[model samples]
Target: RSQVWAQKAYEKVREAAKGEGRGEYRDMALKLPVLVRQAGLSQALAFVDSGKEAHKALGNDLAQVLGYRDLRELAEAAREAELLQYLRLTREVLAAAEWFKRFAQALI
Candidate 1:
């Protein structure tokens, strides 16, 4: 279920980013899974959103995959989410990020 949604979202994101800075988009796609693993969902997402234009673009896709209406809602939740909520949020992100990474390598 999550994987399917991730694939669909990544497809949209990839097509959208293709015309922009493809290299920059791909760079964030490649790095995000690892980044989230090392840091945390909130921290990694902030880094992505602020990293640069292309990276910020991908942040939208991440939020979509994680089930937020948008990046701001996700960021707000990150700041206020309680213990179990935070854990599940990060877990879903980690799981979906693998799909994003795969599609980025294959399609981007």
Candidate 2:
């Protein structure tokens, strides 16, 4: 999801380069998400290794902006949150089932 957001940010930058001024792009850029240092550096190195301009692939400086040490840690935290959400949802299902059973008994 963050990757997609970063892509969206790139697209905005591209469009800005085509027509919008620096200030315009800056405003558009501020609202977009970006990749982290470890991930961003890795991708930049890949692009450079593949013969692309180093600057073109330097990627975004988004770690501090996102309050994380690195993308890997942030991604791990995201996964944990996802797992917790499912756990909460499973408990909700059990509670709903209990209510349904009570309603069934009342009906009889």
Candidate 3:
């Protein structure tokens, strides 16, 4: 199956979990999926970016999962996506976030 997303999320989260951001990343992971669902990706990212440094860090991490170079690029794309594209993009982010949430619980 499609394990690439989980693999990437694991590598990224594991690196952070071993360092000073363990708790913060864990909390963000637990919350990001829900935020994405309730507020949509763009709004959730804005919230994260507007908050703590750790929140921005996780926001960028999610951006990487979506194959963007950074959060700004990801945000720009999300802003421009058409209706169909937007729904597809949201679904993909949701799927990627599941792995992030799991890895956060396991490794952080």
Candidate 4:
């Protein structure tokens, strides 16, 4: 039910990773991980309340909630995404908003 948090965390990363672009990772590296952890913890607590058995893969499902196969996979993807994002918002790159600005006139 509370996969809601995971989705929220996903949206957060898209914005934070881009806007806080100190080489593109401060918020994603820290804040997103915190939200991801909360997603895991919240679900684990719910599982406990529901009387689920303790197991090694317990809470592993939460990684998929953040759109990864597992924790290690998520960590790797996060780093790569951060680096790639750094290349996106520079003068060397095209300003995306400028392209979208044409929408007003293109409506002709």
Which candidate number maximizes lDDT? 3
The whole-model C-alpha lDDT of candidate 4 against the native structure comes to: 0.32
Full ranking by lDDT:
3, 1, 2, 4
Tens digit of per-residue lDDT, candidate 1, span 1-108 = 876766766775668555667677778878988888899878887887675667776677777767788777787797799989988878877777777777777776
Clash count per candidate = 0, 0, 0, 0
The lDDT, on a scale of 0 to 1, for candidate 2 is 0.33
* Per-prediction TM-score: 0.86, 0.24, 0.92, 0.26
lDDT-better candidate, 2 vs 3: 3
Question: Model 4, which residues run further than 4 Å from truth?
Answer: 1-59, 83-108
- Per-residue lDDT of 1-108 in model 3, one digit per residue for the tens? 238888888888988877776798789888989999999988977777776666677778878977999878888888899989988888988888888889989987
Q: Give me the displacement of residue 1 in model 4, in angstroms.
A: 11
Cα error, residue 53 of model 4, in Å, equals 12
Clashing pairs in 4: none
lDDT of 4 by residue, 1-108 (tens): 234533443443343334423222331232223333454423322332232222112222234444466544534444455554533322111122122112212321
| Better-scoring candidate (TM-score), 2 or 4 | 4
lDDT of each: 0.76, 0.33, 0.83, 0.32
Better of 1 and 3 by TM-score: 3
Please identify model 1 stretches exceeding 4 Å from their true place.
none
lDDT of 2 by residue, 1-108 (tens): 444434443443444344424443343223121221233323422332232221222122222223445434433444455666644533432332233223223322
Q: Where does candidate 2 have its weakest 10-residue lDDT segment? A: 52-61
